[PDB]
Amino acid sequence: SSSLYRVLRNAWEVGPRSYWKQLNSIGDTKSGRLVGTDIYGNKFYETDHQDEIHLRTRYVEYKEKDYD
Amino acid sequence: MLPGGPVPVFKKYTVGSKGIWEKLRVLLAIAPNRSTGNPIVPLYRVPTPGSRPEANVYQDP
Amino acid sequence: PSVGQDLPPVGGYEPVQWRRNLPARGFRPLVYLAALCGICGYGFYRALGGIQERRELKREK
Amino acid sequence: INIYAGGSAAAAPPAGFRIHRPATWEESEEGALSKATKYFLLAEMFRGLYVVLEQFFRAPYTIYYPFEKGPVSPRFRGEHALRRYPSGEERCIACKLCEAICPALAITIDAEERIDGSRRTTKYDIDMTKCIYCGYCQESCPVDAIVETPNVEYATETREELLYNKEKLLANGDKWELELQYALDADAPYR
Amino acid sequence: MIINIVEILIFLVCVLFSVAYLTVAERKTLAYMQRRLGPNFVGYYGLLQAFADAVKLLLKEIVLPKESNYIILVISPLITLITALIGWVVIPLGPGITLGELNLGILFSLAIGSLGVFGSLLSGWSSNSKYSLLGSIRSTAQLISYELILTSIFIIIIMFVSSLNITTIIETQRVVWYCIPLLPLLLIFFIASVAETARPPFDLTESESELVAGYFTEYSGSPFVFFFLAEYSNIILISAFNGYLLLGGYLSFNYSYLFNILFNDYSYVSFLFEGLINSSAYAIKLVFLMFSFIWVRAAFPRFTYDNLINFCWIILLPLLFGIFLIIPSTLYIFDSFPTLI
Amino acid sequence: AIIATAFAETVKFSGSKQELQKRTLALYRQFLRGAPTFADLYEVQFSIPTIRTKIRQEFERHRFVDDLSIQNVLYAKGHMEYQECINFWKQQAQFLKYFPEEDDIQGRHQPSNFVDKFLKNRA
Amino acid sequence: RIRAFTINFGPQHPAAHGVLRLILELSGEEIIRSDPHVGLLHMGTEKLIEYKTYMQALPYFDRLDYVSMMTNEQVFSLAVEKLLNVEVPLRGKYIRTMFGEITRVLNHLMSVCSHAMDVGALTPFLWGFEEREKLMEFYERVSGARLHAAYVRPGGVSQDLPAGLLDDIYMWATQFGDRLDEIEELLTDNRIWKLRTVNIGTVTAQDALNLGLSGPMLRGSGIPFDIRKNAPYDAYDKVDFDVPVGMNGDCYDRYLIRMAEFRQSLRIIEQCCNDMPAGAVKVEDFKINSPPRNLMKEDMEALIHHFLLYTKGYSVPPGETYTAIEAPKGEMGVYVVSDGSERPYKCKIRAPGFAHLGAFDHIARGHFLPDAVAIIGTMDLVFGEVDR
Amino acid sequence: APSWENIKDIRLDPKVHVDEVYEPIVNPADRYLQHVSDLHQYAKYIMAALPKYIQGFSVWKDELTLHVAPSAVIPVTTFLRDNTSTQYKSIIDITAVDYPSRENRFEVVYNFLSVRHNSRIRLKTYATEVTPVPSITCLYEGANWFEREAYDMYGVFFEGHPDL
Amino acid sequence: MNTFIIFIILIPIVRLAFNAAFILVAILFLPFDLEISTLLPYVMSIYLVSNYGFTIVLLFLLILIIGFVYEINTNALKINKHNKPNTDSLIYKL
Ligand code: SF4
Ligand code: SF4
């Protein structure tokens, strides 16, 4: 949606630690349920909100700072 | 009308506005018929191509 | 035969808009000119009223 | 009915082909002051700018690639891989059909009789700098050994890391087997 | 003279930082108009992109072609930045809250916008090759042809107020902004402003030369950076001319009844809140017009040099030499010639 | 109409050796007059006389060709190359293809008798 | 005496959709002579095809144009079927049609919206390329690849459509007219677009025919030629559509034709989605088309045929043919020759951008450089095609 | 009341069911027989009309070919461009082909089109590495580039060409 | 030392052919610039020259509009193309 209410509600949903982590990694704020974690430690989420267009429902949160 | 439009918004499969924002859009739009163009997530590309049930029943035509 | 083939629906699909949908909008132009000259004339009134008062304040000074 | 001389009823012109005429300034059903206002206040220009602005308030299409990937299909053709049976044995038998149909002649094979009396490979190479990613090689194989993964993230700093050999392909297939099983379970019936 | 140093450094910091983030604002505004985003990865939402483009260009080689001049390609961007910056001195952010506070401020800006052309003139002489010297000529003819049209508007409004002090011109706009009686001049001034900066839809030479092997600004290193802090500042400056000439400058809602209700005395708080309100009106106006430079860029296609010189000397100038006759007549009809104060 | 470029000659197959003699001589003359241009346009590291020497060598190559049609073909190809060179179409590499000799001696052993070729398996 | 000034437009040109060394000769601003140089991207396709089977060579014809792949391979499929004397099944015809029009959309988008960007309007480009990127998902679903694909093969189609594709096509189709209209708003009625496109690149009927020009360049002069009507090939005879035509032969008329072709192609896509017959998508003769795998792994003759088609290939009868299509650029064509072998003896791709660039000298004489840009943009040459 | 949130989910809509697909077996060449008889008559007219030049003609599936010699190119092209029944005004292609087994190894091929009558036609000559061919740039300006191609690709020399 | 005086020092120290419209545009920019600059004294003395110097500057501007009229109707600034499109008619002697 690119609206401010989205980021504000998301930052209320997921706490400030995850906010600064998302800001330092993705560049966006995103909140959604966990689906699981792989063998390298990378966590994978999914969203249901209407605001999120196609191809932005599922996202990753890498473990290493040097993500690839 | 003709066999080629125009067609309203509630038949186009795009993500639109809801509530007072729709009234405002239909006010401030050159053509309120027009769509944002973002597809509707529940429908577009669902079920995913790697999970289509129809592949188990498929047989060479 | 055919079993699992991607096939159309029985009632077909609802028609799409393929014709031009650029609806002419706006008032007729002379209204936009009449608002233009009216805004201008109101601004000339308000300004030339502000010049005559500056003239008198200068007479005082 | 009609007899034609160096012509036909198709090449006869359309009934209304002759365009009527250009209109002049007279026979203009739009007064001079109206089109003057549209000339001096730049109407269609403001309209185009407003159609631009409405996009300013709409959802952008962009996705963040390393954290959100774009759509991928089972039919997709990326990196190569050599598969195995559930038994742990490899599927390649050196039929050398992949070596023959390949347009770019990237593949290079050399077989011989294995110690157990079977047909197997000692060399299987792919020059991914020759590959065009056509998928004819996953189509010819009658055992579904060679495949093309959806992986596309295999760039390198050197051109000699792209001359894949058998060991680099067998490990790539050991790695991506779960993804290959998904794509195969939803692509094989059509293939 | 300490606070004079403080006041200079404040101004320079505010203007240069505004220029740096006008680059980012140009890119993000233009992006969202194009249904994309970004720069939003080089900072906390892209607020460090401009300093990254800078620092990359300052650690970049200073490479000079064989058959080129060195001194001309070096000083000419530098002199362009200087001339573009000194026009900021006469620009007010409050009634007398100006560094210059000259009584000839209009004429100072008008003489400095005449000195600006020399950057484009000396660029073509940085290339001894023959086609660049004609491409610079195209780009000079647009500027000197459009400066006649910007000036003519300065004179048309000064018929209303007979003073070259910028603050006085703004204080006469308490009664009404001069964009209401002379609304068409708002379009004309904004068109000509976009032209003088060689901005789209008037970017003929940079495009016509981007195809060719030369005839553009093929600089590198620091001179790139100065030319891109001199384009994005001449933009604000020409937007400011629009502001203090037609849009009331720093003026806003009368804050008489509010300040009466809330303060009771002239303290060093009321002066601050006043200067905040004034500058904020001046700033939001500059923002809307910088948005408009971008808005125009996103939409309209390009002009050709024939269409452009024809636009100027055959359509705009006649309307203005007409307006030169209608306005003095309009004052003479009603006995409303302004006084010298 | 699609008009011809600068130094274009229309292809015309002469029926006699006596006319092609003249046309070839004009081509040789043009190459020689234009050699300094071939030295300026292409950043050349040798003499104008050496260019004229190579031109004389290239014309001595086919000096003993008596079949008329082959001579007409050779003349047309040479005019093509003159048009390619004088208009700045060729770059330096495609021009110095004709001057291998000027480049530095490629190594030491350049076999010319049998035994060296045998030791290098070139016989 | 007018002495000229030779300039290179540049082999390193941001504007051109490819690499072109254009040598112009100017007397001030006016162009008087033009010598388009090419071969900077000529890969040598027509020779290599002679060493490859008729199947191995299909990928060549997709790399001859950066866009417009599925039509470019639809020409080779038709030539080789005409030689083999086989008939495509109906479902394969309708698919080849639908993807031909999806491809014409994908080409006209790039073409019109590169003309814009070379003329300065950066925005319609990026408003259209998203539509291209939704339409390429359909490509990756049917073929696996995003651009160069190889779906259409001699004897029909490689693999059938996956389930749930016509639905998504219908969705995109219901929403596409709006975005085309948003492009028309900026470009069509605008003044500057007309100033840059009205009485430019003007070419007459007789000249357009003498120069070999086809497609919109010809339909802008007033001649109604469309191979899809005058010589229907796949299913363009079993589906309704109209052919726009224009007077004045300028760039503006060609732009209007291209937008009209967008909308008529949308009409065709809707129709084909509403009637996709069942059946096979490829010829049922396993001597030409590889069989299914559930037979190749259970029946002997099918495995033999698989082996031979994927080693030696199929033997085309001796003969020769030029067959052509209405490719979005123009009238594309292939001149194949056969000698009774699985390898072609000759294959000349007739490339409409070739004749377009060849006419460029006749078309640009008298015009200034911005108009030369607009002219190359009317033709929107794809220089990989121009260089063959 | 209606909105995109209440839009019909077409994915569930009932889909056509076909039990047996019926595709008749047919030769694709029975479609062409009458056009082929017509092309034979037309070629016969042209051979009777220009006996000095036309050596032969072939026909194969709605494609005609006329065999000539290099001298006969300009005349026959004039006939095929200017005659009323054969207004072949457009030049589609030029192509050479190498048949080394022949004395004259090359075989230049012109393709032509008539938007008027909606027809194509071919025209073949022969050449060698040294025997040139007349250029039809006198008539069709588009032949300029195609003849430059055929020269560069195969070596054939097109006499009269302004800039080969 | 004034802040203007501090600032106005600190900033600096920390073969071919052409069409004659290319040259006329510059050559004509001079007189029109001198006109618009000579109009400055009027706008700054407009009150003191009440209704006399008004009429004087109008005759000034009208005289200058004459020269502008001469420029337009000559079409000086227009670019002229040499490779004209043929508009003769095709006539065959019989
Ligand atoms: S898919 Fe790749 S590896 Fe396989 S044959 Fe084609 S180019 Fe070669
Ligand atoms: S086709 Fe399959 S089995 Fe045969 S050689 Fe290739 S990979 Fe091995």
Side-chain angles (χ1 to χ4, degrees), chain G residues 26-42 44-56:
Chain G
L26 301 169
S27 65
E29 286 187 344
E30 202 196 72
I31 294 154
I32 60 182
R33 171 154 65 202
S34 289
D35 182 42
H37 278 251
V38 292
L40 295 159
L41 192 61
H42 175 79
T45 297
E46 300 160 34
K47 180 141 198 75
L48 293 168
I49 288 160
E50 300 168 11
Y51 286 81
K52 316 274 178 204
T53 64
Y54 285 94
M55 190 199 310
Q56 273 168 305

Side-chain angles (χ1 to χ4, degrees), chain D residues 82 91-99 109 124 137 140-143 145-146:
Chain D
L82 277 169
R91 280 167 187 265
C92 197
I93 54 182
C95 70
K96 301 187 188 215
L97 275 73
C98 55
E99 198 191 16
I109 298 166
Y124 190 97
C137 61
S140 68
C141 191
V143 293
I146 195 83

Side-chain angles (χ1 to χ4, degrees), chain A residues 5-21:
Chain A
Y5 168 77
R6 191 179 65 92
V7 300
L8 285 162
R9 169 254 295 170
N10 283 5
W12 290 329
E13 270 191 16
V14 302
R17 152 159 174 66
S18 194
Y19 171 65
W20 296 100
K21 194 183 277 274

Side-chain angles (χ1 to χ4, degrees), chain A:
Chain A
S1 197
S2 63
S3 55
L4 184 71
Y5 168 77
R6 191 179 65 92
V7 300
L8 285 162
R9 169 254 295 170
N10 283 5
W12 290 329
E13 270 191 16
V14 302
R17 152 159 174 66
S18 194
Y19 171 65
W20 296 100
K21 194 183 277 274
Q22 281 192 47
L23 190 70
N24 289 126
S25 82
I26 310 173
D28 188 12
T29 309
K30 281 190 85 92
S31 313
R33 68 197 191 94
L34 187 68
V35 169
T37 311
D38 71 351
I39 192 173
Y40 186 83
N42 297 325
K43 280 147 73 185
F44 297 92
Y45 297 106
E46 196 170 340
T47 71
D48 297 89
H49 293 293
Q50 295 209 344
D51 308 343
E52 276 61 20
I53 60 159
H54 179 46
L55 312 175
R56 298 197 67 213
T57 45
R58 303 152 186 221
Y59 67 92
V60 187
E61 283 211 38
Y62 293 95
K63 183 176 177 71
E64 304 280 350
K65 204 78 191 275
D66 184 54
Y67 60 86
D68 197 45

